[PDB]
Each structure stands twice: as structure tokens, then as C-alpha cells.
Amino acid sequence: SKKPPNTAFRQQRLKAWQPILSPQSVLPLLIFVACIFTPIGIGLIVSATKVQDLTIDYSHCDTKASTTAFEDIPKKYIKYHFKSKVENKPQWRLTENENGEQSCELQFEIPNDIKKSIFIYYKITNFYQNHRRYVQSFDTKQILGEPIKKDDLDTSCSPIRSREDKIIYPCGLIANSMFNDTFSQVLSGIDDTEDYNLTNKHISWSIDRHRFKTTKYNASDIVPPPNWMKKYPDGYTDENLPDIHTWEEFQVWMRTAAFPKFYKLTLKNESASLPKGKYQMNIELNYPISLFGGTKSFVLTTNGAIGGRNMSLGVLYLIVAGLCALFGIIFLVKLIF
Amino acid sequence: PRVIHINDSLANSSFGYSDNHISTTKYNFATFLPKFLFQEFSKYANLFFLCTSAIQQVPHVSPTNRYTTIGTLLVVLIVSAMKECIEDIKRANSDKELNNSTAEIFSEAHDDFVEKRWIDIRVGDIIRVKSEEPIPADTIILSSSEPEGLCYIETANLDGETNLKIKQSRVETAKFIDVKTLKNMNGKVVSEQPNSSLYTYEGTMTLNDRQIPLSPDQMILRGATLRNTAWIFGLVIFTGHETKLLRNATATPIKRTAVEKIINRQIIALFTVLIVLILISSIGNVIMSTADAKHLSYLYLEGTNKAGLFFKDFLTFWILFSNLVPISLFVTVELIKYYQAFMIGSDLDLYYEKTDTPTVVRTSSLVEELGQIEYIFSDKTGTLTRNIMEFKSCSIAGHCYIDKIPEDKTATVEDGIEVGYRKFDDLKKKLNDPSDEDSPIINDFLTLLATCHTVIPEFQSDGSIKYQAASPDEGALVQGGADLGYKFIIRKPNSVTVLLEETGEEKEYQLLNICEFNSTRKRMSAIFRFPDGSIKLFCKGADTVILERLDDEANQYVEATMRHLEDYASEGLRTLCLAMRDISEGEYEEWNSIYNEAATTLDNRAEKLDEAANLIEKNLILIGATAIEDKLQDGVPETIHTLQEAGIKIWVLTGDRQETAINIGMSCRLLSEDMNLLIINEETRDDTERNLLEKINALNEHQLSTHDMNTLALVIDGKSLGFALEPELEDYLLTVAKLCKAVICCRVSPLQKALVVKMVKRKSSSLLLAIGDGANDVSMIQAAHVGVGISGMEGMQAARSADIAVGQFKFLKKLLLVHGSWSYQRISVAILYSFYKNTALYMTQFWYVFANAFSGQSIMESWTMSFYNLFFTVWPPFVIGVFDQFVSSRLLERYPQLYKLGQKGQFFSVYIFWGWIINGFFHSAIVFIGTILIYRYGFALNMHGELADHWSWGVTVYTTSVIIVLGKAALVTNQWTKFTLIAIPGSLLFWLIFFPIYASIFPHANISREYYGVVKHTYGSGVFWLTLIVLPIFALVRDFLWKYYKRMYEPETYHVQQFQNAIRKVRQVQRMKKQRGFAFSQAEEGGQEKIVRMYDTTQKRGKYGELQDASA
């Protein structure tokens, strides 16, 4: 009437397995690990050394480049990895226009046919996208397009949301600090070399092109952010108002980074392959590096299976398979002694 | 004083007395909120997170959202309140089976005894208690069925005394014997206040224009049991919680276990890691934001003052690092403690089949205290003994006779003194031979077994005869006598008759005079005129009183009897020497005149009848001696030997007399042969301080070996224990009690059984257990660290108020050595893991402050981090502490010295807590440095050039820290059942299914809006699935090598006479070598004088029940 049942679960005698730790038990475990991690580990190294890239640090182009001819870039600003050997170092010159705005023109040689897709990034160092004041500083409803009034704005976009009894429309530290350098959408071939057109469409994420919708503000109650006031000197009108649904360079910047050294995508070309030739990229210099104190670069990678030329994952598979092939032998060392 | 009217219930409730219920429960409906909150806030993790959740409410401070830690705190405070309520309900319905027990209650409108419950007993309510029924309230008897309205009560729950006490109703009230005349009682009863003084009472009843001076001879208490009488008609006075034995019994107190006191030190040891890492991260925020103020102009930093946003960022790192302290640690260990109490109460080896009673754990907060017990404070009567006495053997004419012979102790060649054993059929063959000369001296021995008593015989409806004895010693002499023939059948007011078995003759002996047993006399005697006409005196008593009254001219069996007593007392039996003398006709009439003038003297007759009794008991002839065995419970001597091998020191605190506890201690092998008794029997407070100092001047003058300390035993009376607990003398007592093997305390009050446990508790760090039964040791159970009660044997009150209620004493072996040492070793590993599990995850927030300019940005999502403590890593702390037997149950019972691993606290310290927190730092620095070299610029994906953002990397940090901490629990655990397969690799499969469903439903409800594109760019990416299977193997490669190295190598276990001639010269030291152990359970308040004169057995029952008139 009160007797507990004699099941093996109530009497603490469940069927159980105890780990046998012995040099005949854990030895085929350590061999199965170090025979399946080494085809993976060298497969992530052979994929990372097939990525071809070129990184030109154009940070001091407004200071260390003459405006007359094509001098060479100092080699401290150049990193590059290709299959074939390069023959000419990349060149660079400054160019002012009738308005007085500078431009940095980088000429470079690509020594072999790159038959993968070509992606143009810019690298920024010493910029804290991951600051706690910075990550949360935007309005979610304004990105969706809702005409939010003043006192129901997101209070985390606090120093930049309202200038003169108005609404800063892309409020926040993120949209105010947007990278302004305009990469030219063509790699101009110099001599006996064709052009290479580069698309700036489908650059951002696919969920970003949905949630970034055109605004339902009417361009009379909204002011640009204070660092956009060179592109919009008179302000916001119904004509010059930005459509952030198709502004896919703005969607890349708002997708913040994890670390103070990051890439951002600008241009891509999936359709064709660029051949060997002397190309030229022109960069309109609008973003000063005295704002954040780091460097800005120009990247011309291709993609691998794990991203780019990053050897860290394949090495991590070989340190682990190195320890699981070391201690598969040092089982036999301490036993005999 | 308390005024009680008789037979009007409306007038005796306007004073507002208590009812008859008792409350066992920890809290009522009123005191549930303060007692549960004080129990939870005394844990330091629940007090820290109450302060953290207020720090999240000041705006712009918290890195996560503001409802993150108050939502986790309300979950664990609700699960902790559910475990408390489903125990206090089980404490309330097991309390309900007492209040709903049967009690016949007189109803004045009905005018008959109607059946009701106990709880319907109000003060002033005349009840009726039948035979062998517990008394339901503090009751004064009015009349009874026995002659002159008497009854016998058993007080084995009031104190430990194993005899019966006569209670005699007043002559003015004993006429009310019928139910129909019970409606004429009109008056009042003036009683005293409840005072918990057991043996004193004063009251005055005015019944029908006449005063009645009441007495403690007219009052029966609640714990007592009415025995050897048909019924009584008493009215109740105190009831419920104002009774004399349940005044100081309170509700279940908060008992903070010793492991929970260690967690409170490892939380203080974790605040000093918290405050350091807040200070490292907040002085780097002041340095960097003022040195690089021209390089952080895109943050639009204010720069108000260096002390203003020091504090505003002091609280941010307080919140970001607050989950170093585990929030789900205390409610995890509460449900390991709840479910271990469930598996204790479901064991068949702790289930008593005879009463159909399993063990139950009421206070389940103390399951792990059963692995650290260092002192067991036991009770004797009912706990160690079965409260049954049986005539074991007898020694007559220098020969011994026993039921069945233990063959090593058989009839051998003597040393001049015959030792050995014979059967009882040889006693029959030596009796029926007129050629053997022992046959006259055997014949007057067996008739002394069936005449000299005060047992009253009552024939049942069958041919079975029931012997009704006050003292259980002389009740076993008649029953054990009658099994050898010469059955005592009936008793007349002036004679007894003995029915001989083999001849069928019924000889009748005239009882002339009887002499009462006395503690100063240590003997009792009776004079019988035989059917021959020749009178004869019989006598039974102690050898230290009998041997001073002998004829050395006559008997030759004396030195053969005394050697049989030493063989009996070393076995543990209770002995009694039997002597007689043949007094002729003329010597009687000059003595009876001397006896009559002593008896008819009104005053001072207590000490003059024995001074008239020793004038006839001078010249006796020693027939021989008896041996009565007080039955112990089964498995008592094997449990005491096993628990003493485990390092536990057994103490005995009993309300019984001293000569019984030495006998039971000799029988249960606490005491032994070749052992010394440090007896402390002193009458004043300065006589014991001499006795405590005279022993410690002698037994610690030289350092004692561990063999010689096993020859010491402390025996202290309850009056000397009341003086040796004065605060000036408390340390002299523990200095000799810690060098003795066993401590016995005799005749101690219910309060003194608590003040001994409260004295070892505050003078040492050892954990104490107190096992007992009945309400005389209920205060002993509230005052211990673990209180155990013996379950229902017609007198349960300790097993209600206890923390564990076991079936008998032998279940203490498996409860401590198996279920106790498992519950300490499993919980100590489940707490060191839960400290580690919140360090391997939340310390990636600290290495991130060097990579975000000391801002305090969260590396992972706000709600994903609360699910870490609640869903995905809550099962391996549970299953390690529950289903993982670290060592076999067959090995813990076989080698009891493995219990000392839990007593020293080798598993759970604060120093070994640092080997897990540093293991949490090392695992957290591999997740961080491993996932910043991968995902270097965010350029780790292959999705048409797209990059992994801040939140796609934060999911890889969260998931890698889950596989690391589940892979650690897969190496920590010892035994892999099928319930570990749902916990350790089944909470990884839980998170890998929960995450695509949580992050594809909840962002559309504006909850966790950082996950809009994370599932495509984590689960669709090849770099995420390759990170999860190489970084946990990289970080647990040291834990797989240390666990393999710990298995093969580095193993742990899971001048004799110079003192013995010096210790005897102290004042009250006795040795157990030639002690001739005498014990008789009769008392002076037992009423053995007049009950032999008042009973006619052949007279049958009256019309009003089983009532018999006084036939004197």
C-alpha cells in the first residue's frame, strides 16, 4: 500500500556505461580524429592560398602624392597575393578638379587571369563600430520608413536626432559617420586593356534590402545629419532625398562590425573574369583619417570557401590534429618506462 | 489560572483555548512570504542579483535590455517556491492522519459516546480511551474499569522509562462508571498554566458542591498510552500545542546546511574577482577616452567630468559582469536535493515491511549533510530497544539452563566452579526425579518465579492468559516461568494459585505479606503459607544487597552463582539473585506485629516498613539467579559497530535509569569487556567540577594511544549533566567526552537532550545527527543538524517533526554510508560545475573590453544569454548531481572507512573552487582568441561577397561556449545512463533546433531584433560548422589529458598497564570486568503494594463494561 516499486529506475540501478580509459580504448579515438582532421586541415589551407587579393593603403594620398605624374607607392602601403609574379609596382597620383576636391588614382598590374568573382572592399582600421554608444545608436522604425515625430524617436540616437527643432532623418552615430569615399564603378584599362565594370547592386544582405524601405517623410520636417551637410548644403528637398531601399552602400555601413579592423563591400562582378592588364581605380577623397585616427584601404579580394586569405582555421585544425597525432604516440612512451 | 467547566462546551470556548490539532508544517498561509524570502536572500547569489536588477533600471547604463536579469530572477524564485509548497503540502497531509484519528467523545445532547476525530476535542470535553490506545490530550481521569478506579499508563514517550505507572482516580469521582449517569457532572476545574513540567501538576476540581484536591497521580499526559485496563472516563485540560510535552516544539526551523555555508564563501570569493575586473575595465575607460579624445570624435563623447562617467560606466561593467555569480545555482541544487530525497524515500532497503512504512524525507534541504556526520546522538528506549523483555536463562544449584545452547558456551570441565549451559528439558528431567537432590531446590525456585511478583492474571476469551505486570522485568519471570511449567492462573485478594503443568495439580499459596521494591533496597520479598501449612519467605534482588544477608553455614552454591552472573552481564543480560528461607510457624507472629505497627502508622511509613522488612530477611539461602534479555531492535549491534568504524562517535541520551543504559550499552556493544566507566554521579554543582577536574588531571597527564582510548567510556547522570552545562564547566566536559569512545547520558530531560546538541554545535564545526522516537526527544531533533525520527509504532511524534522518518535504527547505516556520501559527493561536483559554467561564457565579455575601447558592448544577444542558465546548460548540473554514482553502493557498505573522505571536506572547499574558475578563464580566452582570428574582418563567409557582422560572430561565440561546457560535463561525469544522453548531448541538439526557430519567429514580434539575417549567415555558412568542431576539441584537450592522467596515475582512495592502573584510582571510576549486572525496572510509584489485595480473577465482569469491584 505504501511500498515503492522495484523498478530499476526507482532503485538507482539503471543500466549504465562507465568510460574505460586505457591505451587500447582511447587510442582508436585519437587515430580517427587525426585521420579526419588532416584532410580537413590542409583542405582549409589549400583553399586560403587560392585567394588572390590586393590591398592599397591610400590613407596618405592627399599628402605624399604629387599631382603631376605617376610615382610609385611606398611598399609599406602595399600588400598583394597573386598566383603569378608581378612585374611593376602599383602607382598613384593626386588630382584636384575645378571644385577643389581631391581624387586618388591608383594604377596597378594584375599578373594573371583571375577567373573567379571579383569583390571590392575598403578596409578601415581603428574605427570602433563595436562601441556600446555606437552599436545601438539608430532608429529601427525610421529605417523601416515610418515618419516618427520628435519625442517618440529612439533615445539611444541621442546626440544626433534633432538640430533646430527638427528631425535628423537617419539619426544616430552610425549614419552620421558614414564612409564618404566614392569608389569609381569601373576599373579603367590603361593601354591595350579593356575596362572592367563593377556592379554596386546586391551588395548588402538580402534581409537588409527588405527592412530598408524608402521613407514616408515629406522632406520639409527632416534635416540631414551634420556630417552629410556637404552633399546636402541647402538641406533636404523632395528631389535630392535619398532612397535607402536602393542605396546599398548605406546598408553596408549600418550593418556594424565586430572589431575595429573591418571590411565593407562596395562593388562586385559575378558575370565575367578580368584578364591580365594595367587597370586604374579612382577614389574621390572625402573621408579624412583625422576623424578616427587609423588607416583606410582598398581591397580587391576573391572569395574562398572560408572567406579570404585567412590561415587561422586551417592551422587550428592542424594544431588539434597535431596534438591528437602526438599523444597517439606518447601513449607508447610512458608505458614502457 | 485556567478555569474549565464540566459538560458545557459553549462556556469552555469563550476563553479561547487552542484546539487539538498540531501543526508540523514550516509555514502557514500567513508566514509564507517572510520565511521563504529570508531563506532565499540568505543565499548570496539571490541577494546579488536583486541588487543587479535595480542597477539595470537607471537609463543608458545596461549593455543588455533592462528585463534580462529580473526575468531570470522571477523564474528561479518561482521554481524555488514550487519545491517549497509541494513539501509543505506533504507535511500537512501526513500531519492530517494524526488529527483525523479516532476518539470517542461524550455528547451531552446525545448522552452516549459518539465516534469523532481527535481535532474535535475541545477543552472541557469528557472522552473515553480504550485499551492500548494513545491518550489524545492532557487528561485527568474521573473513573475507570479497574478496582477503586485505577489505570496503568505507559510513559515511553514522556521519558525513556520502560515500566508502567499507576494512576488512580479520586474516590469522590470514581462512582461515575456509567455513560447514562455521566450527565450529572456540574462544576468547574481550576487548573494550572501550561509549563512543560512533566511530573508536577496542581489543580482543584469542584464537583457537585465539594472540593477535590487533584494531583499528578490523577493526571495523564498526551504522549502516554493507556495500558492493562479497559477504559477511562477522563476530561481533557490542555490540548494541541499547550500540552506539557509539545509546548516547546515549534514549526520546522530554517536549517542552513553546511554546503550552503561554503557556497556563501565562494560567492564572496567571486565578488573579489568581480570588483577587480570592474576596476580593470573602468580605469582603462578613463585612460583611453581621455588620451584618445581626438581620435574618438565620431562617438560625440561628452567629457563632463572624470568622476561623473566613471560611476556611469562603473555600473555598466557591474551589469555586464554580473553573471559571473551563477543565478541558477541555488535552485539547481534545491532540485538535486529534492530529487535525492525522492530516491531516498523510494529505496526498498530503507522500507520497513512489518508496519508497511517507507522512509520519508520531509526537510529535503539536508540530504547532503548526511555525508558529513561526526556525532550521532541516539536515544535508547524504542530506538535501540524493542521494549520487550524475555526470560532468557537461569542459574540454579551451580548449573545454568538456557533455551538453545550456543555450542561454544556448553557444559565443560569446571575450575571448581561450573560454567556452561544445559537445556531446559534437562531441568525437567532433574525435577521429576526424587533421586536427584536438586529437585527440592529446583521446585522452590520455579514457584518463586510464579508467586513473588505483583502480576495480575486475566483470562481471555480463549484459553490464553494475559499477564498484566507493572514492571516488565517481573512480567517476563512469570511468563518465562510458566513456560517451564507451574503456570500462574488466578489471583485472589489474599492468595495466589499455581497450576502445575505435567500433573495438572493446582496448588494454592496464601500470600501473607509482600515487601515493595525500592531503589534504596534493590530487592523485594514476599511470604507465602504453603498448602502444607509451612510458611516460607521468598526474596529477589541485587547481589550487592542479597550477599550481605545469607547463611554461610548452609549454602554452597554462592561462588558458583556469582561466576554465572559475570558470564551473564558480559553477555548483556539483566540479572537478579533469588534467595529464600524456611521460616517456621512461631517466628512469624512476633514479626507481623512489628510489621503491622509500621503499616498502620500514618506518616513516615516509606522508610519504616523496610526497616521492619530487614528484621526478617537476614538469614537467607541462595537458590540461584535469573537472566532477562531486554530485546534490542534487529541490526542494532551491527549498525553501531559499522558507524563507529566510519569515524562517527555514538552518544546515547536517554530518559531511562542508569543501570539500564549500561546494560543496553553492554548488549549493543557500545561498552565492552576490558573497558572503564568514567561515571559522574554528583549532587551539587561543585561536586561535579571536582569530578571533571579529577579525571582530566589523570587521563591527559600523558598522551593516550588510540588503542587505550577505546577502553574509556563516559557515563553521566542527568542531574550532573544539568551542572556540567553551566558555561564555566562546558569545556571540561567536552575535554573528557572527546577522549572517550562512547558517551552515555542517563535520566535526561527533554530539554537537556537539546542543550547537549546545542553545546556540541557551537563548540565545534562537526555535524551532528539526532535519532529518536516519541515526544521526549522532539526538542533534540529540532536542535540537531539532521533530525531523524523512528516511524509509526503506535507512538509517533518524533517522526512527524523530523527531517527524515526511518522505519528502525538499522536503516541509519545505508542512509549515511550510501545515500549520505553520494549526496555530498554529487552535489559538490554539481556546484563546482555551475561556477565553472558561468565563467567559460561570461568572461568573453571581459576580453572584449580590450577590443571595443572599454565601452562594455555585449558580445552576445540579450535574451540568448538568459537561455544559457535556463534551458541549455541546466540539465548537466542536474544529472551529474543525481544519476552519477561516483562509487558503488556495494563498496560503500563493505568498507565503512571511506566515509571519512566526506567528513574532512576533501571534495568541496574554496581552494578547489579556484581550479574551476581558472579553468573558466582559460576556456573563455580560447573562445575569444579563437574566434577573432577566424572572422578577422568579418570576411569569413562565401555568400556572394557578404560579410559576417557583429551578431553572426556573437552566435559562434555562444555556441562554441555551449559545446565546450557540455563537453566538460561529458568528462566530469562518471557514469553514462540514458538520462545523461538527454542532458549532455541532448541539450546541444536542443539549442541547434531552438535557434533557427527562435530567430525566425521572435524578430518579427520585435523581440531580439539582432537576429534578422543571422540564421542564413551562420547555418548556411561553412565557417560556422567547422568552427564548432575544432574549438571545443582545442579547449578540452587539456581536460581529456588530465582525466586520462588522473585515471592511470595519481590515485586517491575513492606500556599498557601504566595508564590502566592509574585511571582506577579516580573517585567514581568502575571497570566492566567483574560487574554483576543487576537491573530491575520496578519503581516506587508503580503501586505494587495494594493491587495484589484488590483483585479477584474468578470474579467476572459487571454490567457497566469490564468493571470489576474492589474485592478487598
Ligand SMILES: *[C@@H]1O[C@H](CO)[C@@H](O[C@@H]2O[C@H](CO)[C@@H](O[C@@H]3O[C@H](CO)[C@@H](O)[C@H](O[C@@H]4O[C@H](CO)[C@@H](O)[C@H](O)[C@@H]4O)[C@@H]3O)[C@H](O)[C@H]2NC(C)=O)[C@H](O)[C@H]1NC(C)=O
Ligand atoms: C564625408 O564625411 C566626412 C566625415 O563625416 C565629412 O567631413 C566633415 O563634414 C562636416 C560637414 O561640413 C564638417 O563640419 C563642419 O564643422 C565646421 C567647424 O569645424 C563648421 O564650419 C561647420 O559646422 C557648421 O555649424 C553650424 C552650427 O554649429 C551649422 O549651422 C552650419 O550649417 C555648419 O554645419 C561644418 O559642419 C566636419 O568638420 C568635417 N570633418 C570631420 C573630420 O568631421 C565630409 O564633409 C563628408 N563629405 C561628403 C562629400 O559628404
Ligand SMILES: CCCCCC(=O)OC[C@H](COP(=O)(O)OC[C@H](N)C(=O)O)OC(=O)CCCCC
Ligand atoms: C592551462 C591552464 C589551465 C587552467 C588551470 C586549471 O585548470 O587548473 C586546475 C586543474 C584542476 O583539475 P580539473 O579542473 O581538471 O579537475 C580535476 C579533478 N580532481 C577531476 O578529477 O577532474 O589543475 C590541473 O589539472 C593541473 C594541471 C595544470 C597543467 C598546466
Ligand SMILES: *[C@@H]1O[C@H](CO)[C@@H](O[C@@H]2O[C@H](CO)[C@@H](O)[C@H](O)[C@H]2NC(C)=O)[C@H](O)[C@H]1NC(C)=O
Ligand atoms: C562584369 O564585368 C564584365 C567585364 O569583364 C562586364 O562585361 C561587359 O559589360 C559591358 C556593359 O557596359 C559591355 O559593353 C561589354 O561588352 C561586356 N564585356 C564582356 C567581355 O562581356 C559585365 O557587364 C560586368 N557585370 C556587371 C556590370 O554586372
Ligand SMILES: *[C@@H]1O[C@H](CO)[C@@H](O)[C@H](O)[C@H]1NC(C)=O
Ligand atoms: C561600363 O563601363 C563604361 C566605362 O565608363 C561605362 O560608360 C558604362 O556605362 C558601363 N556599363 C554599364 C552597364 O554601366
Ligand SMILES: [Mg+2]
Ligand atoms: Mg525513545
